[PDB]
Design a protein around this ligand. Sequence first.
Ligand SMILES: *[C@H]1O[C@H](CO)[C@@H](O[C@H]2O[C@H](CO)[C@@H](O)[C@H](O)[C@H]2NC(C)=O)[C@H](O)[C@H]1NC(C)=O
Ligand SMILES: *[C@H]1O[C@H](CO)[C@@H](O[C@H]2O[C@H](CO)[C@@H](O)[C@H](O)[C@H]2NC(C)=O)[C@H](O)[C@H]1NC(C)=O
Ligand code: MG
Ligand code: MG
Lengths: 481, 481
Amino acid sequence: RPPNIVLIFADDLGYGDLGCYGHPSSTTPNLDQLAAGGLRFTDFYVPVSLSTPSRAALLTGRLPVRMGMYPGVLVPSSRGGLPLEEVTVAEVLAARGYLTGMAGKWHLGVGPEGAFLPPHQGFHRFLGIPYSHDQGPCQNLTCFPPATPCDGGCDQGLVPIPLLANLSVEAQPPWLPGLEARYMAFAHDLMADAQRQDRPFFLYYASHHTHYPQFSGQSFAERSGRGPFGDSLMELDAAVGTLMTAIGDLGLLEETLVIFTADNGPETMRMSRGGCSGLLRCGKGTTYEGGVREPALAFWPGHIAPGVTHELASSLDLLPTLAALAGAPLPNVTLDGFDLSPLLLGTGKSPRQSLFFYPSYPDEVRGVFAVRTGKYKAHFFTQGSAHSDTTADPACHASSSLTAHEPPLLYDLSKDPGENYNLLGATPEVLQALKQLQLLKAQLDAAVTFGPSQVARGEDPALQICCHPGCTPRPACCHCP
Amino acid sequence: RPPNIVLIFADDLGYGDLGCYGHPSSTTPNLDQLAAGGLRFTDFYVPVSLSTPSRAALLTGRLPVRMGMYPGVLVPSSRGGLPLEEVTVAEVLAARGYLTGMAGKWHLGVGPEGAFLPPHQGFHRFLGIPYSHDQGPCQNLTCFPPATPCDGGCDQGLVPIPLLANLSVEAQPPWLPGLEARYMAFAHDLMADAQRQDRPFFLYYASHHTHYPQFSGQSFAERSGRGPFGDSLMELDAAVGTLMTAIGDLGLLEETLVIFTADNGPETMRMSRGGCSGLLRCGKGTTYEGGVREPALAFWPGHIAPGVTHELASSLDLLPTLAALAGAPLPNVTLDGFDLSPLLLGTGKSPRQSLFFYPSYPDEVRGVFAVRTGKYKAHFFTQGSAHSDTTADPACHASSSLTAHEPPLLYDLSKDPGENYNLLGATPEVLQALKQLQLLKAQLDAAVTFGPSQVARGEDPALQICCHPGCTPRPACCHCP
Ligand SMILES: *[C@H]1O[C@H](CO)[C@@H](O[C@H]2O[C@H](CO)[C@@H](O)[C@H](O)[C@H]2NC(C)=O)[C@H](O)[C@H]1NC(C)=O
Ligand SMILES: *[C@H]1O[C@H](CO)[C@@H](O[C@H]2O[C@H](CO)[C@@H](O)[C@H](O)[C@H]2NC(C)=O)[C@H](O)[C@H]1NC(C)=O
Ligand SMILES: [Mg+2]
Ligand SMILES: [Mg+2]
């Protein structure tokens, strides 16, 4: 009865990057076709605009400060990880009998002997890389076949990036032009195996696209007409069409819920090799709309009718929605999202009225940076980020430092989604939205206690995954392509 | 045989304003539905980003400097107008027997006794206003019923805005909340009369939306969820759905070509009461992509198949395309556009490879400001505009003055449609695009001779239209609502 679930989570992809969100040159025909037969969200969000914290919020339905996923993101030598006590979506569904699987980027911790890898947090199967694909040296990797090198090098002084199969190293580094096919094959098998055992599957496809450095297999190389970023986006888009073909082929169309979104806004610092936030301001790394507002599609033929909703939703709402849809019961913890099944099925409205945004480097004295209620968004603190540099708007740059705003900066996102015209720069509607925004910030800051930081537990180079355990010299002896 | 033609031309409407071009809150379901069953252009342009010149280019297929339509726009007291010798699209079709009609804004000159009004340039019928609706005082007009006044006042010291029926004043001023219905009724009659006489009609619907000040009839007032700009946009969108219903009702669906575009980018100076260029830079008044790149839809069921083209097209190409489609012969003059029927019908490619952009205040020493060839656009001169002020990008402001660029600023619009990353800030592809752009600018500047300016022939207040001819005191005695 419970539907099969496929959750596709792109990386560093902006609001204005899909064809259906208005980009003029992107090539994304399969995602356009899922939008044309599904529910396209104009106002969907992540609460924090960096990789680790966004991934924590999606899998647990909880604000990332609650379990210590701040500040910044995890690195290969990190001791910390998403605590084992947190209950992930995969745990929830596994318990109700789903065959659960994951392909792609994890970025929730590796840890002493791989204690924080996906196999320990509810996934029966896992093929992927434990953190971003640029967190290891890439000056010798090929990003586009036959022999176009990845640009710029990536992180230095580290072990090459490992492709893992559950807890084992399958390759190190892997061959980037072929990851996609490896991942389509793993997905195909998980589906067919679940069909064979009469059980609902759960696939978590965390693509590496469209994070730096860009890479694609040879059928996309130089075919998109938007350069490397396009080629990579187009391969993501062809992976989606492949999952949808597999779904067809097994007669699972009307029995599978498919959701597509992305962790955080675009890295405009990669300039024309990075994404596009469309009309929204800034990108990755900030609490402006361009870093937290993501594309989001939901497609379940015969259940979700084609259309466009403007209602509020968050990545935080998808554990509780998915639990509801599968008759699985919610963990016994404070959850920050809601069930959106009425909205999806067309019998209700979203229960969500407010959204709370924390910065990359949060703290307990300052609290949440921005809050949206209804159509109004208030910024109490503002800040630019090096991930959002190089555009003409100077509020996005790393040189725009932390600035308190009292009274906050106040925007009407229905008329001014671009965040240009501060409404307090008076009216009764406004003054009443101002008092509610202030009360919601003070209530949340008074009730949330931050979990102790996982990222500040430091680093240990000995925690790095090595294909040839005990070899020497570390890290470059660690490799087995 | 020749199809019926309906040409809808919006006012001050940006690339990112329709739902189908990605806006998050606009309400435009009828335009979304024409896009979903028609050809949506991602790269369509006007050559000059102001009202008069754009309107001249569309009706004549010629660069506006050729017949003196510069600098700036015409005003009510202007002596000048689009010369009578120019052959307009309406002239072309009338000669092949179309019943030709026009509703809405003309802005191509009034002149001594109305010599330049539409009835003299090929339209059998005309109901509309001879220039923009803000070019007369509006502090006492109602923009939204029952009694919401137009905001800010409009131009002072002038006659109220006249609604004309051919050459006669029907009302002065007209009641803005009802213009739309007046215009739907005129369109309905022109269609049915043409059906009755067995003849092809040509309708030219130059809406006042979404120019300042905004206004709508009462079914849209406060219903769009994007405020006044939205209400006005939504009424434009409901007028389109009305024309399409009328087309249905007479069984003319498969026999009518319908084209939708707009004169120029958004007036961001009206802030949240003005339009949105999406990911493009700046707006009205500039030669950046946000002022010259417009939305554009073409819909002719059973002839134009649904889709998206990225090929180059201009408003300049639509006299010659429309002549071709109706078997009417081209005037005997140098034309700057091309026939796009192959592209529309799906048998060819656009013949257009290059686009030439002039500024609002052109001159013969400087020549064209920017040129696009293929994917590359070069800016030889750059300039901001008061119509594009108030955003965060300082290149759009009136304080960014005229700056020569040598070598030009060079952008790859397929990877960088936002015009952020100057590619000469080297490569053989680039250096060859640079030499071609430079040669195309020098060829065009050497071959075009500017026609003597119509706008500099001055003003005469006695040329103002008056409902009560000879009355006193002028201009406020001129009125007959
Ligand atoms: C590693 O871990 C999982 C779990 O054991 C492997 O398990 C699957 O492998 C085969 C089918 O692919 C079967 O032998 C097992 O039944 C199956 N187990 C479950 C619970 O499905 C898996 O192959 C490895 N992970 C992947 C796919 O890389
Ligand atoms: C003014 O000018 C035109 C042309 O005379 C008027 O003409 C039309 O009016 C009636 C139908 O609407 C008929 O009496 C005429 O046949 C018809 N003429 C043509 C050539 O179509 C018209 O009513 C006025 N313009 C409008 C519609 O306002
Ligand atoms: Mg990311
Ligand atoms: Mg205009």
